[PDB]
Design a protein around this ligand. Structure first.
Ligand SMILES: O=C(O)c1cc(C(=O)O)c2c(n1)C(=O)C(=O)c1cc(C(=O)O)[nH]c1-2
Ligand SMILES: [Cl-]
Ligand SMILES: [Zn+2]
Ligand SMILES: [Zn+2]
Ligand SMILES: [Zn+2]
Ligand SMILES: [Zn+2]
Ligand SMILES: [Zn+2]
Ligand SMILES: [Zn+2]
Ligand SMILES: [Zn+2]
Length: 562
């Protein structure tokens, strides 16, 4: 019944023009993570009840209920993709990919799936074995698939999911365990043909090669773009970020003093060709697995950064003070530093630290980052007391935007990392080749944190804290609410004006996935993916007083009583 009248998904849908739907990971191309739906608000959220839920596949459950005209399209782990009736929770269809033995995959991160994408009459995803796959939206049956190469034993995969722009399926990659770097590809949405492929590691003698400290090309590992892809329709620019290089220690990399051009860089590209329009490196010389690959939002804001605002690193030399600009803005890296650029040109406006961090010594008025020499891993076996951690700070769990108050709302972890490079020689399988102990940041007794930052001034308007890590995306809504899960297993709503908790329910496991909102027949639903991820096992032991069990992977859907 729900799938019967399926109407093709357009750019207008993906631009978030219909608030009854959530047809893309962050609700719109621009990455807002916002639902304009306002039925559920501060005055009635206390009445929210569980309407329906459904078991999801085991593993790291970081997915998102992609909602479209009464149907939920849901990427589970293990390349299981489902369509579910958004009103009843009844399964409509299920695709289950035939997988080689899990042991054959050197990159287990490809098993988790933050999103599927929609366009036309198809559901698009990247499989664990690194195929761009198109399913029929109406049936879940495979329409086409294209092998990108180097999957499985060779470890190239994807965890965040693609987006489709102008008939082009755009998808990044993780090559976390590989002795090489990876890429972002653009694939024709109809034919399945690969149209372009952007890589990051400079080839010998090419632009930026001289910033790799003389490291042989074949020793340059793991540079990818595994985070979330965003897009601005008006500028026609696709935005993504690349990551660092492994192992973490530049001494073990053989890249001493190397700023590593291509790594941790924010790219703005044309969707049909991958042509780079502008780029900015937000974390050079990375020794801290900083991964500047997370979603960056496109918003229109007045530009008036306060140089005295807490954490403000610098203000751009040519900042158009008092003027309204379309900006690319947010926290791109685990470090927790918020950035703001002109979205069209890439001109640097400002940057501001959130959590305690000590990897960045300074950022000048052009946006040039200078790293902290004290934190470069120069002596293997020596403990370096890095802030934040290889899980942040921030990590993949996405921020949300509140257009009414111009607030950027970001989930964060108050953690630091006593990190040491191993004394043994690094192989690709060793990843960062470090051993670490995670601790609370100095003077912090609350691990979980959400900052709400005014995008005009860079001032933090409020900060919500809780004992255990959140490590879960936020949803912002027109009802003036912020929804967020945590490893404490609470799925909570915060007052968007104050950051104070106004409602919560406790789910059976750590609330580990995305929260989305949609409506059917005038009724607003709030859907959260839960069960657990790397967050609980990593942050849980720091606050053992909190019951942060993982389990009962599932989608859980709430609404006001009828
Ligand atoms: O370098 C990479 O290719 C890559 C990929 C992934 C992934 O795809 O999930 C993570 C990381 N790195 C990473 O460093 C880490 O912070 C991390 C946490 C998570 C998670 O699911 O909670 N994924 C990843
Ligand atoms: Cl529609
Ligand atoms: Zn539509
Ligand atoms: Zn990584
Ligand atoms: Zn725009
Ligand atoms: Zn720049
Ligand atoms: Zn816009
Ligand atoms: Zn101020
Ligand atoms: Zn509560």
């Amino acid at each position: 019944s729900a799938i019967e009248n399926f109407q093709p998904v357009t750019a207008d849908d993906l631009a978030g023009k219909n608030p009854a739907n959530w047809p893309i990971l962050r609700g719109n191309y621009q990455g807002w993570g916002y639902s304009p739906l306002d039925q559920i608000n501060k005055d009635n959220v206390g009445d929210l009840q569980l309407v329906w839920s459904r078991t999801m596949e085991p593993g790291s459950n970081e997915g998102a209920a992609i909602a479209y005209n009464g149907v939920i399209f849901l990427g589970n782990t293990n390349d299981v993709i489902q369509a579910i009736d958004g009103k009843t929770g009844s399964l409509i269809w299920e695709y289950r990919r035939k997988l080689p033995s899990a042991s054959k995959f050197i990159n287990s991160l490809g098993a988790a799936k933050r999103s599927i994408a929609l366009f036309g009459d198809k559901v698009y995803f990247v499989s664990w074995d690194n195929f761009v796959v198109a399913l029929d939206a109406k049936t879940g049956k495979l329409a086409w698939e294209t092998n990108r190469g180097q999957g499985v034993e060779e470890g190239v995969a994807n965890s965040s999911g693609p987006i489709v722009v102008d008939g082009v399926v755009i998808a990044g990659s993780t090559c976390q365990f590989s002795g090489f770097g990876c890429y972002v590809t653009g694939t024709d949405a109809e034919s399945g043909e690969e149209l372009w492929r952007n890589t990051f590691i400079p080839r010998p003698g090419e632009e930026g090669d001289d910033t790799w400290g003389g490291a042989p090309y074949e020793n340059r590992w793991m540079t990818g773009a595994w985070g979330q892809i965003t897009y601005d329709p008006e500028l026609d620019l696709v935005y993504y970020g690349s990551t660092g290089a492994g192992p973490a220690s530049e001494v073990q990399r053989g890249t001493e003093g190397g700023t590593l051009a291509g790594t941790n860089t924010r790219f703005a590209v044309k969707p049909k060709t991958g042509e780079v329009v502008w780029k900015h490196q937000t974390l050079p010389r990375d020794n801290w697995d900083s991964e500047c690959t997370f979603e960056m939002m496109v918003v229109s804001t007045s530009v008036n950064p306060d140089a005295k605002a807490d954490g403000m690193m610098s203000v751009g030399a040519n900042v158009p003070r008092g003027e309204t600009r379309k900006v690319l803005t947010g926290v791109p890296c685990k470090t927790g530093v918020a950035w703001q650029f002109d979205a069209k040109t890439g001109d640097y406006f400002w940057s501001k630290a959130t959590v305690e961090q000590n990897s960045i010594a300074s950022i000048d008025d052009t946006g040039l980052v200078t790293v902290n020499e004290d934190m470069i891993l120069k002596e293997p076996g020596k403990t370096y007391n890095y802030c934040p951690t290889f899980l942040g700070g921030r990590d993949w769990p996405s921020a949300g935007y509140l257009p009414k108050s111009n607030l950027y709302v970001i989930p964060l972890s108050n953690a630091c990392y006593d990190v040491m490079a191993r004394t043994t020689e690094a192989t690709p399988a060793d990843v960062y080749n470090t051993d670490a102990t995670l601790v609370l940041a100095p003077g912090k007794t609350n691990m979980g944190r959400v900052d709400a930052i005014d995008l005009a001034t860079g001032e933090t308007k409020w900060s919500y804290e809780t004992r255990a890590a959140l490590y879960d995306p936020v949803l912002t809504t027109g009802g003036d609410l912020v929804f967020v899960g945590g490893i404490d297993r609470d799925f909570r709503a915060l007052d968007a004006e104050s950051g104070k908790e106004v409602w919560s329910t406790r789910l059976p496991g750590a609330v580990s996935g995305y929260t989305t909102s949609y409506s059917i027949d005038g009724r607003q639903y709030v859907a959260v993916v839960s069960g657990g991820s790397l967050g609980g096992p990593t942050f849980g032991p720091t606050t053992p007083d909190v019951d942060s069990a993982s389990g009962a992977n599932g989608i859980y859907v709430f609404a006001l009583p009828e």
